[PDB]
Symmetry: C3
Subunit: 285 residues, 3 copies
Amino acid sequence: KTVQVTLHAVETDVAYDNKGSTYRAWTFDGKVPGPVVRVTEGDTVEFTLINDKNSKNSHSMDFHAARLDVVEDFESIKPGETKKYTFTADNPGVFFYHCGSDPMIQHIARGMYGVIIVDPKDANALPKADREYVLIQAEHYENPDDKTAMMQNKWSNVVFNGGVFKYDPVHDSEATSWLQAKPGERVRIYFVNAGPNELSSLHPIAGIWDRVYPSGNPKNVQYALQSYLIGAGDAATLDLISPVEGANAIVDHSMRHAHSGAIAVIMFTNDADPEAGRGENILIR
Amino acid sequence: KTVQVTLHAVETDVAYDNKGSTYRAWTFDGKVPGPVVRVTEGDTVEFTLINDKNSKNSHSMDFHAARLDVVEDFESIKPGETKKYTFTADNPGVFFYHCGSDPMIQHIARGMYGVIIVDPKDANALPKADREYVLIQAEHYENPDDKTAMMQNKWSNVVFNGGVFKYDPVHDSEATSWLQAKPGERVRIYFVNAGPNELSSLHPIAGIWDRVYPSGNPKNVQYALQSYLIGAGDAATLDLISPVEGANAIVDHSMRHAHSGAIAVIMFTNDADPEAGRGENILIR
Amino acid sequence: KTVQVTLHAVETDVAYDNKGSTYRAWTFDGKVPGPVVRVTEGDTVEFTLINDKNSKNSHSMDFHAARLDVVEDFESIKPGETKKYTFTADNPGVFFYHCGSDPMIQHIARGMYGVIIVDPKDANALPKADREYVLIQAEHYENPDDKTAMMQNKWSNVVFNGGVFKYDPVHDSEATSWLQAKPGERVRIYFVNAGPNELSSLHPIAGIWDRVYPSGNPKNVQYALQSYLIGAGDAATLDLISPVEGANAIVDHSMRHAHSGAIAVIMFTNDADPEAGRGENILIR
Ligand SMILES: [Cl-]
Ligand SMILES: [Cl-]
Ligand SMILES: [Cu+2]
Ligand SMILES: [Cu+2]
Ligand SMILES: [Cu+2]
Ligand SMILES: [Cu+2]
Ligand SMILES: [Cu+2]
Ligand SMILES: [Cu+2]
């Protein structure tokens, strides 16, 4: 089928921790990360980017699910300009999308990143998921304007979905979000490493990845991995099943990353919220 | 079968190089790395952790081979406390174990790590190995109390099995240990990257990895790799076969890691010790 | 069949950027990277290394395609001396070669690196390539004598084939080289991360990797990957097909690397040069 996706380049203040601390973010649609885009393999995506008039910077859009021309299709547009392009989603899986404007390092770091999920045309290529969660890793830099610190990889925090310990009520008592499932259910994690610089060695504490799909593609399946390496600008699908009640903690096992904020708690309870990990609750804000 | 495994959390001085330099380590059973735990797939592991009365810190245990609750099972216990939990080793392969107490970065860095090997229920899933060797990579930090240096990733050395150039008599004249095999033998390396922070690009100089199993799982088999990436908190099984007499040098090919201590020499000779890499000489201490 | 390979350890000045800046380099045959070596699976390689009399340092050779003894075969020879060894290429794919003399970190960093390509015995194992290109990533250091800076991972640029923005004329107008292909053609990238320290997260901007082969081995085939991690001292074979005219940008997606010069542009035009990416044009100099 054909789908219309319109997104705005919005420069606004967003919270980045549990105590309500804000920063001057560059965003898609006024939020970090950007909205989840979900299509089926083979779908035609008609995309539109509107750079808001009140922006002070040129912005662009790069989809990893797209096969196009970088020069003309991914070009930067001025504040008050509108850009359009069309692409088919040829390959199934999970894909990084982000702004590609100069310098990309700053545009990604300030929050211009998201995920596009491409469902396989064969609905039985992947085992049925009972829950779905989007987690995007990024480095937070204290000063959004300091490009030298970004080049020197001097980040302040490594975060999931734009928030320091966003999904960690165990470590941060002021956290208000966490992942939910029942024991026995298959939990599908759509993981993207936005970077711009760092690695992610993703591990579920007190559990194991039942299956891992590099770029989310069914052909690339790997089994019973304790950890998986997701490089900067890469994405993967990871499945998790708990045999018991309690919790797992999804972490970047490079410990200084985890200590700085990269920990997500998933609670396995018999009375789990039926709306959690389903419908439009896949990325928890 | 049911296997009883008991470990003590011991805070003691251990050597970290060949010149006899020591540091105040946190350990399992007073050694770095901790004891090798070996079971068969499907076994019931009854685990017990005793935190020694003379310890000054709380300690815990995290098995990557276990599927449990992080909150209750992997909880910190005080000195003079004893903790028990039971898990089944559901998946075959090679798994990282470590203390999971606060801060996890420091508990690992000070030496609280080890390996649990889970032999496949099907004894013919893996090709017959003639030698077996455990190698665990970790970063050594000059001051075990300086948590800022750990967060900044400012290690002094990258080491195998707790010692600077522990298995390299070629570079270090004070090194007494090395790996042994005969030409044509299949040498199985159980590799764990304990971290806490760094990645490992493992390569056998003058050799090639015959087979590589991500997380040690046979289903994930990879053929004839020159190098394999093991992330922090990850593990893999790697097979090596030399057609000639002489030596190979297993290195972390990120050369600043290798230069700082991450080189292990395997000698291929016809008069190789029949006890080497067998029984319980698999982790050479 | 048997092939003769002779290389000279040459210490001479070479350019490393588009503005013509030079540095005192250590090289094979007087160029960075060294010459492309190409054989077939099963071929016997009779290798010869000559260290030039005007050289100030000892040099050696390490082939990742060779299964030998590190002590005798990969030994360092003094200026004016000659080293000879013979090996078979037992495994097909793409392999890193470099000098392995002390300190190995400096010898690699100063330019003593290249690639040996081993074509599969089964000519059908890989789908037919219409274009072939060699890209070798390395770090450039401002002062080639500063071993401490190399040990601290303090590089100036992350480069492809020795040059800062060598294949990026869109970003840098003084760049005189770029990759060429037609739409629909299969472009095969033989990629090597020489390091000596850094990791690469290779992604084609506005494209996708059709197939990826770890170590270049057909048995390890991966499909439709947006990115692929190549550790230091590792190599991979990556296929790229563009459905349309325009451009793609092959980048190390760790943005600090890409911003420092790790971007290579491939132009997809209907009348692309028929000599490009074929014969001896595979490594553009
Ligand atoms: Cl032991
Ligand atoms: Cl045991
Ligand atoms: Cu932007
Ligand atoms: Cu990207
Ligand atoms: Cu501890
Ligand atoms: Cu762990
Ligand atoms: Cu050299
Ligand atoms: Cu090498």
